[PDB]
């Protein structure tokens, strides 16, 4: 099967920039007619693809004439002449002209703006959890910016890696500014055990990670 | 033009599901009909494709056995059986309307997602939780609502009667280890949490559970 790789894998773009994202093949795509079939089809989160170009280079209908393709045997580009908040979305190359027919690899487009420094949060458990028996602990941080994120789960001066959710939300509308929820599961038989329960996150804005903690002795 | 998918399924480990797309105001039997599977992670992977007016159908390597197309001229539907479905299978697969050479996929399907896991309905677990005791109150604070131990998908969280929407930073669910979760957050001015009552609504139409927790100062 024909592999086809695009880049880069994320192209943060602020608004009215031009936008390139490239896509190659494994092989050469031409087709004896005299064209040769690539198309580009663009997927907003929670909605099914959509058509933008066909053939390379020819436009699909209905599509805004910003968008603009080209290429050659085995080298295609996308452009946009200008951003706009509807063009938010993941963009694949699909290869029409040897059987089977392969999708690209997947080109997230992103607004770019003032990266913001994230506000760290703690939430220990909650009485629910402990007349359930379990123990909950989970750590927020909102509003930040770049993906340049990673939190450490360091208690009472122990590193523990092992029950550890990685959730985080994808770029909002109203402030473009992503967040990371990572929650520690703990059972009472252990969670008293310990002491002190700290959240380590560290950022771009600020190179000292940021400190948020709370004592079980109180 | 429309091409219309079957509902969303959940089946368990080693079991064999069959979606079927349904095709209407054009010739249903002229046209391919492409299989596209994407994971909930990221990117779009072709199964194959099948022609419903002859038999031809083509398959990935990757999917080689593990799909198989049948299609029916009568009812202009076409069906695509999954076998052995693993933890993997879980993902979103589409139909689309593809005519090699001439036409692009235009057309696609609304999409069926398939859920592989051992679980049954549960209804959701749902734990307020407020800022930490040993924690500095200042003008701004974050707001916290958990919702775990529910299957399967969706909740949606809402506050009352949308009382603050926006400002709120929801989070994709995550599995600890079979059961799926969520967590909710939102800042409120510092003097207006206290005094104003603020709470998050959880919904899970699948198990037809709704639940309405306040939260409270510590
Ligand atoms: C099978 O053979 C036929 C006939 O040779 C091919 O039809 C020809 O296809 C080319 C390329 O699509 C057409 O030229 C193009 O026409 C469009 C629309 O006018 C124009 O925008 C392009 O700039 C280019 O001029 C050509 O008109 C067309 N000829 C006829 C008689 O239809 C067909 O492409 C071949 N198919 C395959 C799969 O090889």
């Known amino acids: 099967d024909v592999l086809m790789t695009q880049t880069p894998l994320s192209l943060p773009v602020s608004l009215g920039d031009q936008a390139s994202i490239s896509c190659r093949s494994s092989?050469?795509?031409?087709?004896?007619?005299?064209?040769?079939?690539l198309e580009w089809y663009l997927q907003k989160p929670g909605q099914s693809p959509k058509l933008l170009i066909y053939?390379?280079?020819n436009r699909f209908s209905g599509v805004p004439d910003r968008f603009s393709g080209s290429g050659s045997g085995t080298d295609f580009t996308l452009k946009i002449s200008r951003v706009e908040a509807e063009d938010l979305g993941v963009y694949y190359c699909?290869?029409?002209?040897?059987?089977?027919?392969?999708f690209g690899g997947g080109t997230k487009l992103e607004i770019k703006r003032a990266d913001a420094a994230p506000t760290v949060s703690i939430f220990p458990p909650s009485s629910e959890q402990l007349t359930s028996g379990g123990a909950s602990v989970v750590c927020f941080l909102n509003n930040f910016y770049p993906k340049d994120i990673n939190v450490k789960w360091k208690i009472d001066g122990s590193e523990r890696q092992n029950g550890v959710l990685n959730s985080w939300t994808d770029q909002d509308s109203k402030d473009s500014t992503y967040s990371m929820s990572s929650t520690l599961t703990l059972t009472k038989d252990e969670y008293e055990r310990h002491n002190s329960y700290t959240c380590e996150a560290t950022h771009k804005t600020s190179t000292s990670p940021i400190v948020k903690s709370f004592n079980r002795n109180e | 033009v429309q091409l219309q998918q079957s509902g969303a399924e959940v089946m368990k480990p080693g079991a064999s599901v069959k979606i079927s797309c349904k095709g209407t105001?054009?010739?249903?039997?002229?046209?391919?009909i492409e299989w596209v599977k994407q994971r909930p992670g990221h990117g779009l992977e072709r199964i194959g494709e099948?022609?419903?007016?002859?038999?031809?159908?083509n398959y990935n390597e990757k999917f080689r056995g593990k799909a198989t197309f049948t299609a029916d001229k009568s009812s202009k539907t076409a069906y695509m059986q999954l076998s052995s479905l693993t933890s993997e299978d879980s993902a979103v697969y589409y139909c689309?309307?593809?005519?090699?050479?001439?036409?692009?996929?235009?057309?696609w399907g609304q999409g069926t997602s398939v859920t592989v896991s051992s679980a049954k309905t549960t209804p959701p677990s749902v734990y307020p939780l407020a800022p930490g005791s040993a924690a500095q109150t200042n003008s701004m604070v974050t707001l916290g609502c958990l919702v775990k131990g529910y299957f399967p998908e969706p909740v949606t969280v809402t506050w009352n009667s949308g009382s603050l929407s926006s400002g709120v930073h929801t989070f994709p669910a995550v599995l600890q280890s079979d059961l799926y979760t969520l967590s909710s957050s939102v800042t409120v001015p510092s003097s207006t949490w206290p005094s104003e009552t603020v709470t998050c609504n959880v919904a899970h139409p699948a198990s037809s559970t709704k639940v309405d927790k306040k939260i409270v100062p510590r």
């Open positions: 689309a309307r593809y005519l090699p050479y001439y036409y692009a996929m235009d057309y």
């Open positions: 105001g054009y010739t249903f039997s002229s046209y391919w």
């Open positions: 099948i022609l419903p007016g002859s038999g031809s159908t």
């Open positions: 092989q050469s795509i031409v087709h004896s007619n005299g064209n040769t079939y």
């Open positions: 053939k390379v280079s």
């Open positions: 699909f290869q029409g002209s040897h059987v089977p027919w392969t």
